[PDB]
Amino acid sequence: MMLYIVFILSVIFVMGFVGFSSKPSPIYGGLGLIVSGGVGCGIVLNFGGSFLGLMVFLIYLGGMMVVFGYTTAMATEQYPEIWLSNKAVLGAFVTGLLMEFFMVYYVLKDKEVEVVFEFNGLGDWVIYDTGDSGFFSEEAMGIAALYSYGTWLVIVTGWSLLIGVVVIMEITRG
Amino acid sequence: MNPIIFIIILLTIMLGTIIVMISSHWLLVWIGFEMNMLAIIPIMMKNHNPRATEASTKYFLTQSTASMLLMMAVIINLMFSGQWTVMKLFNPMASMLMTMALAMKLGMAPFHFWVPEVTQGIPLSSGLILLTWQKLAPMSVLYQIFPSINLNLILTLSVLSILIGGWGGLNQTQLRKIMAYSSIAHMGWMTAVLPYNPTMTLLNLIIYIIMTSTMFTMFMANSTTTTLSLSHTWNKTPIMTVLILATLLSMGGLPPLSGFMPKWMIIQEMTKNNSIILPTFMAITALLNLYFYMRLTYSTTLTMFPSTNNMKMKWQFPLMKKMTFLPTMVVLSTMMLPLTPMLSVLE
Amino acid sequence: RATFQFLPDEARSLPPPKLTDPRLAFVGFLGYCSGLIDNAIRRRPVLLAGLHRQLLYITSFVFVGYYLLKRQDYMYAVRDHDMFSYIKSHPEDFPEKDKKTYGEVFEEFHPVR
Amino acid sequence: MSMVYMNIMMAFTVSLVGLLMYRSHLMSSLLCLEGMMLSLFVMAALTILNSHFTLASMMPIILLVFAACEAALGLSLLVMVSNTYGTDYVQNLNLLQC
Amino acid sequence: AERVAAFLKNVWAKEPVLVASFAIAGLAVILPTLSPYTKYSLMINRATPYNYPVPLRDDGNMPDVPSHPQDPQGPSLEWLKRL
Amino acid sequence: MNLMLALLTNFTLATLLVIIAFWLPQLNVYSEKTSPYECGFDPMGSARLPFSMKFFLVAITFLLFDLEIALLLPLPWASQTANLNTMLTMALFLIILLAVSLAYEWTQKGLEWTE
Amino acid sequence: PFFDVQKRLGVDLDRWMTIQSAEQPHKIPSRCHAFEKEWIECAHGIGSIRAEKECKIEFEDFRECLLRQKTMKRLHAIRRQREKLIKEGKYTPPPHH
Amino acid sequence: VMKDVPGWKVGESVFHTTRWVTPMMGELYGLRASEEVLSATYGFIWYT
Amino acid sequence: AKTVLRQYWDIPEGTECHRKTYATTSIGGAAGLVVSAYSVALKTPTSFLEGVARTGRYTFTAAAIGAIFGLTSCISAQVREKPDDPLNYLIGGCAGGLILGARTRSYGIGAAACAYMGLTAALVKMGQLEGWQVFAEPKV
Amino acid sequence: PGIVELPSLEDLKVQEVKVSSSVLKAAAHHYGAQCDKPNKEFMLCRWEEKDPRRCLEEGKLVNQCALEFFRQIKRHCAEPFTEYWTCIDYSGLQLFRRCRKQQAQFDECVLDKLGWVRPDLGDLSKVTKVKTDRPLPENPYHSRARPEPNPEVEGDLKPARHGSRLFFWTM
Ligand SMILES: CCCCCCCCCCCCCCCCCC(=O)OC[C@H](COP(=O)([O-])OCC[N+](C)(C)C)OC(=O)CCCCCCCCCCCCCCCCC
Ligand SMILES: CCCCCCCCCCCCCCCCCC(=O)OC[C@H](COP(=O)(O)OCCN)OC(=O)CCCCCCCCCCCCCCCCC
Ligand SMILES: CCCCCCCCCCCCCCCCCC(=O)OC[C@H](COP(=O)(O)OCCN)OC(=O)CCCCCCCCCCCCCCCCC
Ligand SMILES: CCCCCCCCCCCCCCCCCC(=O)OC[C@H](COP(=O)(O)OCCN)OC(=O)CCCCCCCCCCCCCCCCC
Numbered sequence A: 001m002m003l004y005i006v007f008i009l010s011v012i013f014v015m016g017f018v019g020f021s022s023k024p025s026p027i028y029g030g031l032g033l034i035v036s037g038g039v040g041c042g043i044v045l046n047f048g049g050s051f052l053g054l055m056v057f058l059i060y061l062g063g064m065m066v067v068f069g070y071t072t073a074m075a076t077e078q079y080p081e082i083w084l085s086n087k088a089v090l091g092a093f094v095t096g097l098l099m100e101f102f103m104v105y106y107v108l109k110d111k112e113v114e115v116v117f118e119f120n121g122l123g124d125w126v127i128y129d130t131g132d133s134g135f136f137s138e139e140a141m142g143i144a145a146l147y148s149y150g151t152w153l154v155i156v157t158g159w160s161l162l163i164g165v166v167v168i169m170e171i172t173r174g
Numbered sequence B: 001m002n003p004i005i006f007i008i009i010l011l012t013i014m015l016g017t018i019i020v021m022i023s024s025h026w027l028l029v030w031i032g033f034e035m036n037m038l039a040i041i042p043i044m045m046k047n048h049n050p051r052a053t054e055a056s057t058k059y060f061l062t063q064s065t066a067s068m069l070l071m072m073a074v075i076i077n078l079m080f081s082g083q084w085t086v087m088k089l090f091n092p093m094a095s096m097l098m099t100m101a102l103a104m105k106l107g108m109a110p111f112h113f114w115v116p117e118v119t120q121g122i123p124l125s126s127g128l129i130l131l132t133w134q135k136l137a138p139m140s141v142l143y144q145i146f147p148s149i150n151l152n153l154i155l156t157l158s159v160l161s162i163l164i165g166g167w168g169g170l171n172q173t174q175l176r177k178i179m180a181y182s183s184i185a186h187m188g189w190m191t192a193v194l195p196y197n198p199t200m201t202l203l204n205l206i207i208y209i210i211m212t213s214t215m216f217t218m219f220m221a222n223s224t225t226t227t228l229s230l231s232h233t234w235n236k237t238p239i240m241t242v243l244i245l246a247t248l249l250s251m252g253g254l255p256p257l258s259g260f261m262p263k264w265m266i267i268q269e270m271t272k273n274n275s276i277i278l279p280t281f282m283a284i285t286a287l288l289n290l291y292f293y294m295r296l297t298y299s300t301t302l303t304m305f306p307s308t309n310n311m312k313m314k315w316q317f318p319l320m321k322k323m324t325f326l327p328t329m330v331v332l333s334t335m336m337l338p339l340t341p342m343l344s345v346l347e
Numbered sequence C: 001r002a003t004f005q006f007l008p009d010e011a012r013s014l015p016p017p018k019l020t021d022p023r024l025a026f027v028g029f030l031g032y033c034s035g036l037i038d039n040a041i042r043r044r045p046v047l048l049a050g051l052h053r054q055l056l057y058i059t060s061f062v063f064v065g066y067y068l069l070k071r072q073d074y075m076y077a078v079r080d081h082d083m084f085s086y087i088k089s090h091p092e093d094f095p096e097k098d099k100k101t102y103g104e105v106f107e108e109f110h111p112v113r
Numbered sequence D: 001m002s003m004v005y006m007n008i009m010m011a012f013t014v015s016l017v018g019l020l021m022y023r024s025h026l027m028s029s030l031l032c033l034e035g036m037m038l039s040l041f042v043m044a045a046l047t048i049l050n051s052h053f054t055l056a057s058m059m060p061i062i063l064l065v066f067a068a069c070e071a072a073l074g075l076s077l078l079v080m081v082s083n084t085y086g087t088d089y090v091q092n093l094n095l096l097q098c
Numbered sequence E: 001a002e003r004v005a006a007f008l009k010n011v012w013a014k015e016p017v018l019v020a021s022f023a024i025a026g027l028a029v030i031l032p033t034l035s036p037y038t039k040y041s042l043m044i045n046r047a048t049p050y051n052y053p054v055p056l057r058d059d060g061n062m063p064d065v066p067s068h069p070q071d072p073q074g075p076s077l078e079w080l081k082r083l
Numbered sequence F: 001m002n003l004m005l006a007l008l009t010n011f012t013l014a015t016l017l018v019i020i021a022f023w024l025p026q027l028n029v030y031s032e033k034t035s036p037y038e039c040g041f042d043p044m045g046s047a048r049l050p051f052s053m054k055f056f057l058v059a060i061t062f063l064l065f066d067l068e069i070a071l072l073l074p075l076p077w078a079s080q081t082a083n084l085n086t087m088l089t090m091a092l093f094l095i096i097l098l099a100v101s102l103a104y105e106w107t108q109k110g111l112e113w114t115e
Numbered sequence G: 001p002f003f004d005v006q007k008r009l010g011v012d013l014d015r016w017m018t019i020q021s022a023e024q025p026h027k028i029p030s031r032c033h034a035f036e037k038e039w040i041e042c043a044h045g046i047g048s049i050r051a052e053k054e055c056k057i058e059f060e061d062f063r064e065c066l067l068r069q070k071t072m073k074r075l076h077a078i079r080r081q082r083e084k085l086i087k088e089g090k091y092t093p094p095p096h097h
Numbered sequence H: 001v002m003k004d005v006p007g008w009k010v011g012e013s014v015f016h017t018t019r020w021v022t023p024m025m026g027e028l029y030g031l032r033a034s035e036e037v038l039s040a041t042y043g044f045i046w047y048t
Numbered sequence I: 001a002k003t004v005l006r007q008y009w010d011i012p013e014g015t016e017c018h019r020k021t022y023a024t025t026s027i028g029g030a031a032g033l034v035v036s037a038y039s040v041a042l043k044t045p046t047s048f049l050e051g052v053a054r055t056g057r058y059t060f061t062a063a064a065i066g067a068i069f070g071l072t073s074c075i076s077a078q079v080r081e082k083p084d085d086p087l088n089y090l091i092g093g094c095a096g097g098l099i100l101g102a103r104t105r106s107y108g109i110g111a112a113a114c115a116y117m118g119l120t121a122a123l124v125k126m127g128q129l130e131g132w133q134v135f136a137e138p139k140v
Numbered sequence J: 001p002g003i004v005e006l007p008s009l010e011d012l013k014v015q016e017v018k019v020s021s022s023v024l025k026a027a028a029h030h031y032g033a034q035c036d037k038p039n040k041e042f043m044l045c046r047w048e049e050k051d052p053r054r055c056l057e058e059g060k061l062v063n064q065c066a067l068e069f070f071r072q073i074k075r076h077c078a079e080p081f082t083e084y085w086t087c088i089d090y091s092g093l094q095l096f097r098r099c100r101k102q103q104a105q106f107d108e109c110v111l112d113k114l115g116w117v118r119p120d121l122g123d124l125s126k127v128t129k130v131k132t133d134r135p136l137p138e139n140p141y142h143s144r145a146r147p148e149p150n151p152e153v154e155g156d157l158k159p160a161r162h163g164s165r166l167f168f169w170t171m
């Protein structure tokens, strides 16, 4: 059962996506996105990406906090909608959950499934690498190379972030 | 906007497009589109009114959606080929997503609804960039991925664009919306010939940009954005009505004007591949473009519409607008046909 | 041939366009028309005003046009060179036919009555 | 493919349908855009980590950087929409029909 | 110099925090070029063996490659021990 | 497995304390007791009404700056490279551009809250 | 690239990260390094039209390494046969399994 | 296990090349108790 | 569409007319559904019921045009004993155009549709006979 | 596509060096000095062949030299060595720096009873050369024959015949 940990997290990942894609109040949509960010961090961690997993969680936690502030200012109503309060929201929520439940039930029944495209269902562990014993984290080595190989990437991202500040100032100065 | 800020933002618009055009890596192509999208939004909002706010919002939502589909295609391509080189894609589902994403960015039908509205909602100067410079990056990507593009998909997009562009322009009185529907139609010719001869796609793109720039510059010179305000031009700058007439006839593809050259060469390349029905259908459908170009010439140059008394006060001042490159552009827009064999420079 | 080069070095084995090339004269005429349109839109005496400006219109059109024609001529030379080299490499795809005279070839006659 | 890819590709599709089926709040749809970026980050990260494509490990980081620029741009326009109309409803943005 | 010196004494009075920031950032940008120990940073980073040193096939003509790790030939770290 | 167990125990312990808190005490629920608090007088309007954010521009700038730290956090690892000439230049370039971006927003009055 | 300024100028802006078999930090190899190297060298210079048929064997091996689709199909069969035999009682695993 | 299966050829490669290919986890631990499979796949990540 | 199109062209003219009407009706119904989906999405119905009413009205109209065409063109081929003649598609095409005028209650749309549906259908048979390509494959 | 040729279980049989990592780490610096030759011959084999099945015999000699190396420690410096690797074993990180006194006792024992000198900092990370008879493999990747290149286009570049030849143009 623990061997399916990545699959179980990916099921919760989708459930969080159905949470905010059905579009209740953005307060609850933010909560759905935070759950998916956490389990998504859990998924990437189980493939050897501790830094990537933690970083995406860290980034989305800051992002959804700003979304929370903007929600209370610019996207609120007298009766914010939970999933059960609106027929359209509830229908999308249940439709997504049922589709997910069926894909999970069948892929775990046949150890395989065909939902448009063929997916094996033997447990995600089968594809893992077998032979490693280096004295370093390969993901850390690749990320650190941003500053020696990715000079060009540094320039365009650095410039884009600077222009971003300039641009938002222009856009929001009516 | 501070003049230095405006220049820096314009250079970032160009840098984003140039990044797309020099990149051998899909990630840098996607970065270039994002950088380009970032810098154009402030140009759309530069006048700060509810219509510009709506225009920019509709543009951001469409472009940001297309970028997600583009990045999805790149990641699928990575899974099925293990590399990022900008070239043919190695998965047909990745090819569909990238093609739909580029069609969205180009505003090709049936992804076209944003082009008439966004162009109408922004200034003429910003619309000029939107309908000319912004076509370069998506076109340059199509130019490289076309071997893996689904032939039925791209020709379906091209045909729908020519029909919807032609029909849509018939009902317009606003100049910016007329240019927007014209752009949709011309995009169809560009991508119709892409599977057969991508060189003819570039010629059509280059000639379209020249003619479109010429029209927007002449509209800017008189600060005209409606059919009726453009009908006063005869009672102010008669020379401008003649230049508008010549360009509009050229854009309609009439010989012996330049705008006939791309249609001529695209028909040639299509007939060489035993494509007879499609080029005939495209040429006949393009008569809708000529119809509403001709209406403009009627109300602008070939008749004299009623004017107003206050117009006499305009006679006493000269045109002060820069009108940069306009003398060259209008000549190239109209008098290039004798030099058609020059298209080999684009090979 | 050479990557992102306007005029590859192999193009110098071709003769340059003559400065009396009829296409270059037409390009120069376009520069002249651009000069006149420049005067007209600014309500200056069309023929006479700003002859230095008109000269630069003609000269700049001719200058750019000379290099475009040089590249145009080069690209058609490359097309011919590629096509003939391919014909040499695949003779069986381009067989030389046996030519028959009309005395031997039967053509149907369709009367116009 | 491995079964994880089924759920991540499903997540991207759910968010894509979420983005394409607007309700009223513009912020609800901006959330779907951030969700689309989250699924791409996870799907990209898994492929790169599994294949030991060492240099590609930085690619997901770069994706998040431009996800934030997109998010900041989306919120800036939401502020201006909110100021104009008093709500972030998307049905107020219909002036450009004519 | 007076205008800049008068400008310095002014920002010390008004914005000492920003004076320290620019002073600190300046030393970051400048001192690495003036330091004599900067070269050792690359040498130390280069001398750290994260990878196995795959041996070369003795073709019979590489006199500067050691046969044994304790042979004289090859790079040495005596410079590092005295650091 | 140790990490998952530790998390489960922490939140199980917190949940149990909340269960005790709700099922141990004697309740006496009535309307006035559970009404919203506003210093003894009834609230005017819903608490769900829009609450203007005067630091909205700093909040958006936080998103961009928050992402810069994700670019900078790998710096301890990048310092282990042999290519230190490039790494130091690029490392300083990123921080300087962040400082320039802060300076711009500062000088253009972007850090001042709306009045 | 549409304009190959990288080739003309001799500057490597992004082609260092295009393939998993290019130089990596500390010479860490990708899992499919050899397969990518074999396909890349087979198809080099001959163009995609020829490479799509003359390097099909190499590309198929590379694709199998990337996604392991055929390997899991094989392991699925063996695992399905084993679970069938066990319940029927026909098979007993060896002590070391 | 595959003795009775009609078309099976035991030990057959999925690769055309005869070069040695490093096995993936499913091949190496294909028929082993989950406890050792769990240790070999997630043991390092889950260790404290 | 590719499979439903092959079915039609894979069953010879005049042989198994009922099967032919199944294929053309299936094509017409699919076209009507596509038109309904875009119509309902871009011009929201006043109520859920009205959206269903508009869909069923377009899908039936489109299926009726497909049914009358595939039947009449097959009957003409059978009766005339000429399975290769474009004229059969002209008669079938015009009949479909007439039904469109019927479902619309407008002799003018009926007349115009008969002419252009009839000619378009006749052109389709000619292209099938002669191998005309609409989306021609790149070759040179 | 062909069956994978695996050695039989009776070709993989070698006597194993059944000691713990703390034991290996304590002796590693002297082990690297003493067993360099078979060890560097196995690693040249593995990197050249890219196949574990092509290097089994070389790998077996690595095991034998290792057992011989540890037998020498057992016969002479058993007690100073046990104290040393017991100290290393206590550390959670197996740190050398915590056991310099026990390391000194071990080092002077093997230096006296065996003339073993500990390699200096940097020695064991050198790239060395090794002599061997085994020939360099010809086609280690088992590469097929590469496709033939497209024929080269060469000759004198001449003006296009009658110009562009586009429709009516005479130039
Ligand atoms: C940081 C963690 C700290 C946690 C500290 C936990 C508290 C430790 C001290 C426990 C002392 C015993 C609790 C007595 C307080 C009860 C509240 C009270 O005063 O009510 C008066 C009431 C008086 O009721 P009454 O019948 O006389 O009248 C009340 C009704 N009217 C108003 C109409 C008159 O006492 C009781 O009803 C029951 C007393 C039971 C005493 C045994 C306690 C059992 C608790 C189990 C409850 C079942 C639910 C599970 C809850 C979780 C179990 C842990
Ligand atoms: C060379 C090979 C390639 C072949 C392609 C075709 C080449 C021609 C390309 C044309 C490009 C546009 C340049 C045309 C120059 C027009 C010159 C002109 O219009 O005369 C100037 C005059 C302006 O008037 P104004 O400045 O006020 O002077 C006092 C008189 N009122 O103008 C006026 O006063 C006119 C005002 C009344 C409007 C009359 C409109 C009808 C006449 C239109 C003639 C021009 C049509 C050009 C279209 C192409 C023709 C083939
Ligand atoms: C454009 C003039 C015709 C105006 C009517 C427009 C008709 C429709 C236009 C559509 C295109 C059709 C053009 C047909 C000509 C192109 C075919 C052709 O002739 O190609 C060759 C041509 C040179 O012709 P060639 O036979 O070599 O004669 C040499 C004489 N020394 O080389 C060329 O291709 C370029 C020739 C273009 C023809 C005009 C250029 C001739 C030189 C006149 C320039 C003006 C000089 C005076 C300047 C006055 C300044 C105040
Ligand atoms: C050997 C040369 C043969 C001519 C070849 C013509 C080929 C077409 C070239 C189009 C470009 C024309 C020049 C641009 C228009 C400038 C002239 C103008 O706009 O107004 C007329 C103007 C006189 O009016 P004004 O403004 O008061 O200036 C006083 C100057 N004395 O200026 C004048 O005094 C007269 C200037 C010439 C008038 C040009 C009229 C426009 C003709 C357009 C018709 C289309 C061309 C014919 C189509 C076949 C093309 C070969």
Ligand SMILES: CCCCCCCCCCCCO[C@@H]1O[C@H](CO)[C@@H](O[C@H]2O[C@H](CO)[C@@H](O)[C@H](O)[C@H]2O)[C@H](O)[C@H]1O
Residues within 6 Å of the ligand: A001, A002, A004, A007, A008, A011, A012, A104, A108, H034
């Ligand atoms: C809040 C909503 C939460 C939603 C969470 C969704 C979870 C998704 C379902 C995951 C369940 C997977 O179920 C997993 O399947 C495999 C099937 O081999 C089982 O693994 C099995 O291996 C061998 C098979 O011979 C058996 O001897 C063993 O008894 C059994 O464990 C796991 O014991 C089981 O845990």
Ligand SMILES: CCCCCCCCCCCCO[C@@H]1O[C@H](CO)[C@@H](O[C@H]2O[C@H](CO)[C@@H](O)[C@H](O)[C@H]2O)[C@H](O)[C@H]1O
Residues within 6 Å of the ligand: E029, E032, E033, E034, E038, E039, E040, E041, E042, E043, F084, F085, F086, F087, F088, F089, F092, F093, F096, F097, F100
């Ligand atoms: C808005 C844009 C702002 C752009 C700001 C850019 C700031 C760049 C300031 C220069 C920083 C680097 O300065 C430079 O650092 C490297 C080390 O990294 C030094 O390099 C020196 O030490 C390294 C090892 O560390 C050796 O490999 C090298 O041979 C030696 O020259 C240089 O002697 C020094 O000149």
Ligand SMILES: CCCCCCCCCCCCO[C@@H]1O[C@H](CO)[C@@H](O[C@H]2O[C@H](CO)[C@@H](O)[C@H](O)[C@H]2O)[C@H](O)[C@H]1O
Residues within 6 Å of the ligand: E015, E018, E021, E022, E025, F095, F096, F099, F100, F102, F103, F106, F107, F108, F109
């Ligand atoms: C590379 C990292 C180290 C370098 C430090 C990078 C950050 C540099 C920030 C520079 C800020 C300069 O621009 C800043 O603009 C405002 C104008 O609104 C100035 O002036 C204003 O702010 C200050 C403090 O808020 C007030 O005392 C003053 O009354 C007001 O006029 C600031 O005194 C000045 O500091």
Ligand SMILES: CCCCCCCCCCCCO[C@@H]1O[C@H](CO)[C@@H](O[C@H]2O[C@H](CO)[C@@H](O)[C@H](O)[C@H]2O)[C@H](O)[C@H]1O
Residues within 6 Å of the ligand: B277, B281, I005, I006, I009, I010, I116, I120, I123, I124, I125, I126, I127, I128, I129, I130, I131, I132, I133, I134
């Ligand atoms: C308002 C006017 C709008 C534009 C009208 C344009 C008319 C175009 C007419 C259709 C062109 C030909 O259309 C298409 O031709 C090809 C042959 O090449 C046929 O192709 C068919 O050939 C074989 C047998 O011949 C069939 O078994 C097979 O199902 C199919 O491939 C198609 O069945 C036909 O649909």
Ligand SMILES: N=C(N)NC(=N)NCCc1ccc(I)c(Cl)c1
Residues within 6 Å of the ligand: B196, B197, B198, B199, B344, B347, C074, C075, C076, C078, C079, I140
């Ligand atoms: N039709 C294509 N897609 N390719 C293409 N242009 N083929 C034609 C070949 C050609 C034509 C002109 C030149 I000048 C050169 Cl050098 C080569």
